[model samples]
Target: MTVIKPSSRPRPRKNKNIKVNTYRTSAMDLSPGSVHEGIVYFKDGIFKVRLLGYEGHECILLDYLNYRQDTLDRLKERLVGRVIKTRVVRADGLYVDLRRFF
Candidate 1:
């Protein structure tokens, strides 16, 4: 788990070099609090939130629980469509910073 220091580090821009290691957390485990803040890596049987500097935690959503159509939905869509798993090309602070995973 990596801690994405948003202040110390500028937000990550597009990076085609995103490897499997970029993923920061697991699909089954999207915890709360600011513990997780990084680009969410998505792939078949592989979901993780790779925080860059804030202490490591996945960004499943900004702040929610027992939810649907967010991270879980996005992951399913990314995988179900057999979409080619690629590195997060963009990072954003909007809508839970999902632009990177998109």
Candidate 2:
């Protein structure tokens, strides 16, 4: 009597390549007192705004008046996901000082 065995083979792995191009605005391009608009975003328990024409840069909301912590928290919650107009108070390095634009 003769017996035949089945063959098992593994497939080769495939490689993938993806390329992306992104252009970010330079801090020098922004001037103090200039107004810009962007959407508020919250991530990792931190609030941030993504300014138009200034991608990949962080725009932090500052309490120049030193409002109460609870007030700030509530304000952030209300602003999240909304498009807000901000005036450029200052721009240093990769960070920007953005304030509400009436």
Candidate 3:
């Protein structure tokens, strides 16, 4: 199995044009510790919310994991939906950082 790991240190936000390579990981593998930002959506028959980063590849599954309810609610209220951005800054080991463009 491919053992994926996080970056050695926290990345500087100023690092512009950071590219996310989705092919390295699969949909079933949701890396913890690393933060993932994307559009929020509730899947059918699923209680937890789905954090869909890319068009449909990177999906982080959880409930109120990081973002606040008010932020999410306000986002959903918007016509375009909110774009979430988070990082798994721990050693829990779930998935990797997920970024998307508006």
Candidate 4:
């Protein structure tokens, strides 16, 4: 008669809720009055900019220039999908106020 032998293999580890290859950013890191270059993205009448150095973070562009309707239209036409320089007007939590660099 043969006796049963116990397994010596280790159990597999369970997958955890972890993110990989992603960068994190905060308002403290992107202080006000600092300049950053990014590409502009438009969605739902909002202009969101993704910074060059911080690919995982995005900032909202403010209408600081106070352009007229025609000028604003032209500005949008020129900015969207284009790389532009911007300055930070304010940084609050996860949000940031960005203005076009002159």
Candidate 5:
């Protein structure tokens, strides 16, 4: 008698094979009030993003956003998975620039 084995392979995501090119930005490039394109993501009421720029270095923009329901919902829906330009509004004690961008 012969026994047959079942397949145990897991399926891959549709974007699993997709390759995204990540660009880097510099502190000078991210100067106060400078605008640049970036990818935005939201989690735990904070906005996280990677600023797309030249190849020398990379700048990550992370900052606490308004905890308002309408604000979060609106931004979350509009920005994710898209490249929107951002302007650095302030560079305070926080090494990271905190600002509003669309």
Candidate 6:
């Protein structure tokens, strides 16, 4: 006599493949007079972003942002030597704090 095999063996659970958009934006992304906690600097008698954006869901500061080769290159190519515009929003996201003119 031979034993029969079961057709319903359980398979291991697989993790959910997810795309995380934690990449940070530059200070240039913020409008002037925008209230935020970070370093601010001056360029040509005007304020400009030394660093922009952040990394991870931790909300890393732009200064702490690590540069990826492609992103760095793109920023250098298009955003460099150009005026960037930004808007202000309440930190709570409850209201539009202000609009930018740049």
The top-ranked prediction according to lDDT is 4
lDDT tens string, model 3, 8-85? Answer: 887777656777668875567545545555554443321122344343343443343345332334334443335565
Write out the backbone clash pairs for model 2: none
Higher-ranked by TM-score: 2 or 6 = 2
Clashing pairs in 5: none
TM-score of 3: 0.27
For each candidate, what is the lDDT? 0.39, 0.65, 0.41, 0.67, 0.53, 0.36
Model 4 stretches astray by more than 4 angstroms? 1-30, 65-75, 92-94
lDDT tens digits by residue: candidate 5, 22-59 = 57863444347666566676655555455546333233
Q: What does candidate 6 score in Cα RMSD to the true structure?
A: 15.0
Q: Clashing residue pairs in candidate 3, if any?
A: 30-94, 31-94, 31-95, 32-94, 32-95, 33-88, 34-88, 35-87, 35-88
Off by over 4 Å in 6: 1-34, 49-102
- Candidate 2, superposed: residue stretches over 4 Å from native: 1-29, 43-47, 66-79
lDDT by residue for model 6 over 15-99, one digit each (tens)?
9978666568733343345644322333332233322354221122222223431133333444444444443332322212332
TM-score of each model, paired residue for residue: 0.20, 0.50, 0.27, 0.50, 0.41, 0.18
lDDT accuracy of residue 22 in candidate 2: 57
Give residue 39's error in model 6 in angstroms.
0.8
Task: Compose the digit string of candidate 4's lDDT tens values, residues 10-54.
Answer: 899998986555467633364577776778888646576766564
lDDT of 5 at 48: 49
Q: Any idea what lDDT model 2 has?
A: 0.65
* Over 4 Å off, model 5: 1-30, 53-75, 89-95
